[PDB]
Symmetry: C5
């Protein structure tokens, strides 16, 4: 029942697409879990969607731990992934370990960190100590104010033992090559359907914000009269390989 | 008084060491009076005492508190305290600070989880007067995250000066080889009978949880009239080498 | 509309001068944004202009964070650059990162640090982790007691060292290099050599942009302004007109004039 | 007058035995000072004698600073030596320095640390920064829960690092003798024989405050006298006459 | 007017003796500044003259910052030098920097640290980051318990070690090198060898300047002062005049006299 890293490995081998959605509260976490969502991402994207800030930089380790605890009270079988917030882990591998440990004590089953080859040593340090790491490469929103290289980043984390490699806004053809090159499962957002799974910010896919949605995002609320049905459709289109479509790439 | 030297003599003589977890003073005095030689204040208290789903949320404060409670009840038995998740893996210096607090709380030895990558930490602590029990094989703090590696882990800790090597859920024949290879006494749980001693979580062996006991666990309460007799039977079986039996091994 | 690092790079390539001014409050930040200031510098110069102290050394990270938040609530399109205060970042690249992360969480889009080649590793450490860096070379006011005051840099055989400081920061990935009190001809060479945009104060008009302390250019202090500073309030009808004349003279390359250059 | 490291060096050179005793309070420290005790050791042994614990490991840095302050208000001429408590200085030489600096600020004139060769770097670090160090080798109570050439190596490494004094506990007398003869600094012993430049005893032990058999290498000096003052003076006289340890 | 490092360098080259005195309060600081004292030393000597302790070791960084602030409210032209107190800087160059930064934030224009060649790296770390350093060599009072009291330095084969200490600091960028209780002939050779000004106390008249503890030179203690100290209060009936006499004798090279030199 419970989704573990082995489960994700089996899904990658079986070619069965993984469904990930961000979650910041207990009620929505339980709803998504029950709707088939396999990975619950307590992302630092909550700085915009929950806190209403202009970027994710101000989110603190305290905020991430609080939301992790909330989500942990609602989740059952889904795996809880928590982001390491800006400033809380890039100082050193030792600082990253301390911040990751706090998230794990709050209820996370894996942590997500941003960065390329320069973060590979941090991934290894954490994974060796029992903390599953999700390496976030490509577009890394914490550096918002700031092909071979992406492949290198991917490989570096894989070699260090990252459990999952997540790619944001990447040429679909490159995401495909990456997914085939790394031993660990991959998760995409604006990276195509050749990844081992997909992720989207709940709020975006529920159409909580006015005006058009990002190009790589699909509104799943539309056509449904219940949030649970909207999420179920997401899981199904992810697995059907219908999402992302050609328009979302 | 049970000391490291006592354990060493027992290994050399083939006399099995009886270890049991303990998180409270009353149970600790009872186990001590019932012949338990090593009291393990383990982070297993996150599940048995705190009721969590894992031992990761256990803090250093929690370990020091439980160690202090056990220390008020213990007499002859050695107190072993676990370094909790996040409090010692950052560096050897951080592990020494955390272990120093546990020793200050009443521990006579500390236990830490990890393979070869933690051996340098074992050496740093042992050289500074802090006896270390290196816990290898199935390390519960890594639940969310292979025969030769285990052997490598055991050798590295032994060479680093580990006072004791504890193995959890390890193929029996592998455990026997490790035990015959390292110089320090070995303790097992789900590791077979060829270790120098055994450990079990108190509540498990007392049948506190409903349902079937884990495979490597035996209910010692059953067939006895008191907690005292259940514990004495556990100690007597470990020493008679009747526990664990074929049915409790992998 | 929003001013980003790419905007500055496009302006350097086009030869359009960048207008930077200091800002420590929300109302003045909004006034300057509306008057066309592109970069709003929350400088540690507030230790003197706001706090009334004799130098910028006593300014703390908390003071820097507070003013940054204030300015962030008034800014609109302009980029916010916040100074890393004395004592909060020179201890190590790790300490600099932590201090810079607090400023970015306070609302900064870039941080400014003082120092030559010995700070380039710090610049690299921060930029690689998403924190845009402005390297400030030449006369660095946090080292005022070591310099003994405000002297022009790059004289004689000191030119190479300044050039070396600029290069190390640029190679370390500095987004912008800021020069203060530097021989104009040297600043021109530096600007023509580094890949990143440059900003000057008392560095001549051949930098890719200019900066002035608000209070200096508004003639808030009694007496005369420094030689490299022009009083724009004087001869103008409002604070809004004074700032607009500054941005216009910077873009027309009339400020700094010959009188304001070393 | 005042007892300085120079005083101790001169005493070793002349063969005049040094009297050291533990002290954790102001009143007893002033009494011992007046009785001729030259070195007052504020030891982590207070964890057992004062606090009543089973070991000295739980003694904290705050406890050592407190007792150091108390003793410093009683002491006049004697040198105050303060122990660096378990867990407060073994993390690194930088940590030891911060802990030693707190003890010096509380009134100590020298600090004592436990450990062989692996602690010599720490000794060098502290001594180079003005903190006199007493290196404690042999039996080190802080490692209670956890050979001739090893002892000599430890003593030599500490002496080469600049230790002001080397303290030996429970060492074969003949071996203590060689160490004393080979190091440039004064040596102090406890259960180390009379061939040391000086002796130390825990005050409560030599005053017979503990119920039970007197420790083997300890002599009860309270016996035969009717004042604590006379008991201390007798210990100092026997140490000087080289009749203790017997 | 305003005393800077450049001023001290100009005086060394000119042969004009620098007058330094300790100061722990604002009133006395203003008086000395008005009497011509060029360097006001907020020394850890306040542990004995102000706090009444037996040594300067118990003085904390907080104490140093507090007195530094007091002195800064009275100082006008004089340069404020603050001592780094025992335990606050010897742990590492990084810790020395953090402590030195607090002193500078409290009002100091330079910090003073005790130590030989082993502290030179710390000297370099500080000066490069804008903190002027006065290296104190010879008899370093924070090491009094290791020293076994106060004793003359530099005789025999120890002379070369002292020279090394001074040159190591001079090479690291020390702004000033202070010598306490060193053979006069050695102090002279060191003064003629390093590039920075030198200040002495019990080091002869050939240093570039002198320093005394205020309370010692005002005769505040009972009995006699050390051999290298002179009571300037005697023969005068105002502290103003007593301080002016110190300044005059230092500049005339009449103090220290033969009787105050080793
Ligand atoms: C877009 C996803 C991967 C994310 O980083 C977040 O929600 O924080
Ligand atoms: C039983 C042993 C393996 C243990 O770690 C614990 O109780 O925490
Ligand atoms: C650009 C200059 C004037 C500066 O550093 C400041 O204002 O803080
Ligand atoms: C006498 C001078 C050099 C001093 O160190 C002090 O006052 O602290
Ligand atoms: Na994120
Ligand atoms: Na455990
Ligand atoms: Na500035
Ligand atoms: Na001083």
């Amino acid at each position: 029942s419970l989704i573990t890293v082995n489960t994700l490995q089996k899904m990658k081998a079986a070619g069965e697409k993984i469904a990930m959605l961000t979650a910041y509260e207990s009620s929505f976490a339980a709803l998504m879990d029950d709707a088939g969502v396999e990975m619950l991402l307590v992302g630092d994207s909550l700085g915009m969607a929950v806190q209403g800030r202009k970027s994710t930089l101000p989110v603190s380790l305290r905020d991430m731990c609080y939301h992790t605890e909330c989500v942990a009270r609602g989740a059952k079988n889904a795996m809880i992934v928590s982001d390491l917030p800006f400033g809380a882990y890039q100082q050193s591998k030792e600082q990253a370990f301390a911040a990751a440990a706090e998230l794990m004590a709050a209820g996370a089953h894996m942590v997500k960190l941003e960065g390329g080859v320069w973060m590979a040593e941090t991934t290894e340090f954490l994974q060796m100590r029992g903390i599953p790491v999700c390496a976030h490469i490509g577009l890394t929103p914490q550096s918002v104010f700031a092909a071979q290289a992406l492949l290198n980043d991917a490989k570096a984390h894989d070699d260090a033992g990252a459990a999952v490699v997540l790619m944001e806004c990447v040429l679909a053809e490159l995401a495909k090559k990456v997914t085939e090159t790394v031993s660990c499962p991959t998760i995409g957002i604006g990276a195509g359907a050749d990844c081992d799974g997909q992720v989207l910010v709940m709020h975006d896919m529920l159409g909580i914000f006015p005006g058009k949605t990002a190009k790589f995002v699909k509104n799943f609320m539309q056509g449904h009269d219940s949030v649970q049905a909207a999420v179920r459709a997401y899981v199904a289109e992810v697995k059907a390989k219908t999402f992302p479509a050609a328009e979302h790439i």
